Swiss-Prot record, chains A, B:
<dbReference type="InterPro" id="IPR016039">
    <property type="entry name" value="Thiolase-like"/>
</dbReference>
<comment type="similarity">
    <text>Belongs to the thiolase-like superfamily. FabH family.</text>
</comment>
<comment type="function">
    <text>Catalyzes the condensation reaction of fatty acid synthesis by the addition to an acyl acceptor of two carbons from malonyl-ACP. Catalyzes the first condensation reaction which initiates fatty acid synthesis and may therefore play a role in governing the total rate of fatty acid production. Possesses both acetoacetyl-ACP synthase and acetyl transacylase activities. Its substrate specificity determines the biosynthesis of branched-chain and/or straight-chain of fatty acids.</text>
</comment>
<dbReference type="Pfam" id="PF08541">
    <property type="entry name" value="ACP_syn_III_C"/>
</dbReference>
<dbReference type="GO" id="GO:0006633">
    <property type="term" value="P:fatty acid biosynthetic process"/>
</dbReference>
<keyword id="KW-0275">Fatty acid biosynthesis</keyword>
<dbReference type="GO" id="GO:0005737">
    <property type="term" value="C:cytoplasm"/>
</dbReference>
<dbReference type="InterPro" id="IPR013747">
    <property type="entry name" value="ACP_syn_III_C"/>
</dbReference>
<dbReference type="Pfam" id="PF08545">
    <property type="entry name" value="ACP_syn_III"/>
</dbReference>
<comment type="subunit">
    <text>Homodimer.</text>
</comment>
<feature type="active site">
    <location>
        <position position="279"/>
    </location>
</feature>
<dbReference type="InterPro" id="IPR004655">
    <property type="entry name" value="FabH"/>
</dbReference>
<feature type="region of interest" description="ACP-binding">
    <location>
        <begin position="250"/>
        <end position="254"/>
    </location>
</feature>
<feature type="active site">
    <location>
        <position position="249"/>
    </location>
</feature>
<keyword id="KW-0276">Fatty acid metabolism</keyword>
<keyword id="KW-0443">Lipid metabolism</keyword>
<keyword id="KW-0012">Acyltransferase</keyword>
Length: 358, 358
C-alpha cells in the first residue's frame, strides 16, 4: 500500500485588492450587508492570467517540498477560468517551470476541483507509477462577473493554491474521500453562455447571465458536503472529536458554520480566510491549507477534514492524515510582475462596458 | 487487485457531412490534396452542443454494458470544446441521464484526453470505491475553426465516443499506460485567445488565430506516442507481435503509419476511420474502439495498444487486455434531434463572418 503525502504547499494571491467599500462605489451594496451575510471584507483581482497565478503557487509548493522538476510525473490544474481551452493550462505551468514529460491536464469540477484533483492524483499515485504530483487550484473568476449584478459581483475573487504530493509507504496524505455531484442543482449556479454554447460572432456575446439562486445553493451545498463528510468519517472509523482541523471551501461563512454545526464539529476547528480573499473557487482549499500551515494551525499527525462544493452541483469531502513535517524545506523568491494599479483601475474597462450595455 | 473492464462502448456522430468537395467550394484546396496528405474524405459537423453528443454516446455505452444509472459512480468527459465552463458538462450528461450522486468532471488534455480519462478512471477504480464509470471523449471542434485558413479548416470534425467501465477481479481493461506531455510543443498547436485570456468586450474577439505548425506537430507526435508505446510494451513484457489491434488517435493517416512502422507493428493492425470523421480530438479513440468492436476487429482476449497525442503537446499510450464479451448486452434507441440542413448550411454564419472580416 502506497500513499501520497502532501510534502509541499504554496499560494499566489494577486496584490490588487477590491474592498467592500470599493464595491459600494459602483453598486447598491454595503460593507455591512456583505460582511454580515457572507463574511467577505476583501478579495483580490488578478492583473495576470490564471496560468501565471498557478505557476507562482506551484513554484512556492515545489520549494516547500524540495522536489526537482525532473521528479514531477503529474500536473493537475483545477480551474473553471483557464487562459485557453487549446491547449490546456496545466501544460503552460509545465512549460513555465521546465518540467519534462509529466502528464498534464486541466480538471473542471468548479470549487470542488481541488479536492477532485487531490483525489485523482492520490489514486493515480497509489495504483500506478507517479512518484510526485503537482495539484493546483487556480482561478481568475473576475473574468466572468456581471458588474451590474450585486448578488454575485461581491462574492468572488482571484487566486491560486498548490500542493506537491510525494509517494510514500507512510499512512499520510489523503485517506478516504467521497466526491460526487448533485446534477439537479446544475442550473442554480451557472454561466451557460461562456463556452462553445455561445455565439462566437454575436457582438453582445460578452454580456452573459450569471445565474445564481443563493438559498438553493446553500441548501444543496450543506446536504452534499454534510453527507460526504459523514461517509468519510463513518468509513474511516473516526469519531468526530478526532478531527483536529477543518479546511473548508470559502464560499460563505454561514455554510462553513452550518456544516460544522450539523456534524457536531467545534466551530473553532474550521480555518477561515474568506474575509481576505472571498470565494476563489478551486483555489479556496489549497490556499486555506497553505495558510493553516503557515499560521501554526496544523500539527504533525493531525487529522484534517476537507469539504467542498461548487457549480454542478459538485461536492466532496476527504480525510487527510498529516505526517511529520509542517515547515517548508525551502522558500521561493517567485512573484508576479509588479502592478501599481488598484482593483478598480483593472476592472474599469469591464465595469464601464457592463454599465453601458444595461 | 482490481481491474476496470470495458463493459460498454458507444458513439454519436452528427448527421451533417462536410465533404472534401464541400471544402473546395470556399477554400483553395482539393479532395486530391486532403485525401493523399491526411487520409480525410469526410467529417461531421454538429447541429447540437458538445454535451448532447456526449449524452447519446453515453446512452449507447450504458445499454451496451447493461448498467443502471444508480450503479454509475464516476463520469469523466474528456473535451476541449465544452458548452460551458460553469458548470462543467460532465454534470450536464449526469443531469440528462438522471445519474444520482456520481463524481462528475471535465478533463482537458486535448486529443489525448480520452486516454487520460481511461487512465484516470481505471486508477480511481483500482485504488478506491468506484464500482462503474462512464468515460466520454466528446467534441464540437467546428466551433473553433478559421474558415479562411485551409491548413486547419480541413482537418477537424465533431463527434463523441464513450465507454463504461466495470470493476472486476479479472485481468482485463487497461493494464499499463504511459501518459505525458511535451510542453516545448505547446505553442505549435494552439488557440490562445479563446478562454479567459481573451478580451471579453472586444467585438473582434471571435476572429482568433488557430496556430498550427504541421511538420513540428508530426515530429513531436511520432516521438511522444512512440516512446510511450515502447514504455508500455517494455514494462508489460509484451513482444510487439502479441499486439492484436492498434486503436490510434485519428489525426493524420501518415502519423498512424509511421507509429506502426517505427514500432515494427503490422500496418493492418491499426483501425482507421479518419476518412469518415476526420480528427474529432478526444472522441477519436473511443469512436474507433466502438467501431472496431462493431466491425469484428477485436476478439475476446485480444491485446490492444491505444496511442494518442494532442495540443499541449499531450501524449500517451496504453495496453488494454480484452475480456470475454465483444457484443453489446442491449441497444439504445437514443438519437440526436433530426436535422435536414447540410454541413455548409450550418457553417454559413461562421464562414460568412470569417470571410467578411478578412
Ligand atoms: C465566477 C465564478 C463562478 C463559478 C463558481 C464556482 C465555485 C462555486 O460554485 S462556489 C459557489 C458559491 N456559493 C455560495 O456563495 C453560497 C450561496 N449562498 C449565499 O451566498 C447566501 O445564501 C446569501 C449570503 C446570498 C444569503 O443571504 P440572505 O440570508 O438571503 O440575506 P437576506 O437578509 O435574506 O437578504 C437577501 C436579499 O439581499 C439582497 N442582496 C443580494 N446581494 C446583495 C448585495 N451585494 N448587497 C445588498 N443586498 C443584496 C437581495 O435582494 C436578496 O434577496 P433574495 O435573497 O430574495 O435574492
Ligand atoms: C479545433 C481543433 C483543436 C485541436 C484539438 C486537439 C486535437 C489535437 O491536438 S490532434 C492534432 C492533429 N495533428 C495533425 O493533424 C498533424 C498532422 N500532420 C500534418 O498536418 C501534416 O504535416 C500535413 C497534412 C501538413 C502533411 O505535410 P506533408 O505532406 O509532409 O507536406 P506537403 O505535401 O509539402 O504539403 C504541405 C503544404 O501543403 C499546403 N497545404 C496545407 N493545407 C492545404 C489544403 N487544405 N489544401 C491544399 N494545400 C494545403 C501548405 O502550403 C503546406 O506547406 P508547408 O510545407 O509550409 O507546411
Ligand atoms: Na486526530
Ligand atoms: Na495477444
Amino acid at each position: 500500500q502506497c500513499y501520497a503525502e502532501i510534502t509541499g504547499w504554496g499560494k499566489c494571491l494577486p496584490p490588487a485588492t477590491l474592498s467592500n467599500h470599493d464595491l459600494s462605489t459602483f453598486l447598491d451594496t454595503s460593507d455591512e450587508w456583505i460582511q454580515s451575510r457572507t463574511g467577505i471584507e476583501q478579495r483580490r483581482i488578478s492583473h495576470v492570467n490564471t496560468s501565471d497565478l498557478a505557476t507562482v503557487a506551484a513554484q512556492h509548493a515545489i520549494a516547500c517540498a524540495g522536489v526537482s522538476v525532473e521528479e514531477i510525473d503529474l500536473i493537475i490544474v483545477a480551474t473553471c477560468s483557464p487562459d485557453s481551452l487549446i491547449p490546456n493550462i496545466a501544460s503552460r505551468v509545465q512549460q513555465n517551470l521546465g518540467i519534462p514529460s509529466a502528464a498534464a491536464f486541466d480538471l473542471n469540477a468548479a470549487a470542488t476541483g481541488f479536492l477532485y484533483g487531490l483525489e485523482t492524483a492520490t489514486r493515480l499515485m497509489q495504483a500506478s507509477h507517479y512518484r510526485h504530483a503537482l495539484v493546483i487550484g487556480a482561478e481568475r473568476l473576475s473574468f466572468y462577473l456581471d458588474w451590474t449584478k450585486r448578488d454575485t459581483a461581491v462574492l468572488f475573487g482571484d487566486g491560486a493554491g498548490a500542493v506537491v504530493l510525494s509517494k510514500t509507504e507512510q499512512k499520510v496524505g489523503l485517506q478516504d474521500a467521497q466526491i460526487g455531484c448533485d446534477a439537479q442543482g446544475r442550473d442554480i449556479l451557472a454561466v451557460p453562455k461562456f463556452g462553445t454554447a455561445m455565439d462566437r460572432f454575436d457582438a453582445d456575446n460578452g454580456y452573459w447571465a450569471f445565474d445564481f439562486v443563493g438559498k438553493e445553493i446553500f441548501k444543496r451545498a450543506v446536504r452534499g458536503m454534510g453527507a460526504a463528510a459523514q461517509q468519510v468519517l463513518a468509513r474511516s472509523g473516526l469519531s468526530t472529536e478526532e478531527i483536529d482541523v477543518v479546511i473548508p471551501h470559502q464560499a460563505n461563512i454561514r455554510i462553513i458554520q452550518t456544516l460544522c454545526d450539523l456534524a457536531g464539529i467545534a466551530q473553532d476547528k474550521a480555518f477561515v480566510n474568506i474575509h481576505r480573499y472571498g470565494n476563489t473557487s478551486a483555489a479556496t482549499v489549497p490556499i486555506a491549507l497553505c495558510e493553516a500551515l503557515e499560521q501554526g494551525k496544523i500539527k504533525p499527525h493531525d487529522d484534517l477534514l476537507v469539504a467542498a462544493f461548487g457549480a454542478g452541483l459538485t461536492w466532496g469531502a476527504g480525510h487527510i492524515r498529516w505526517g511529520e513535517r509542517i515547515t517548508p524545506l525551502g522558500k521561493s523568491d517567485a512573484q508576479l510582475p509588479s502592478c501599481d494599479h488598484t482593483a478598480l483601475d483593472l476592472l474599469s474597462k469591464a465595469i464601464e462596458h457592463c454599465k453601458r450595455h444595461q
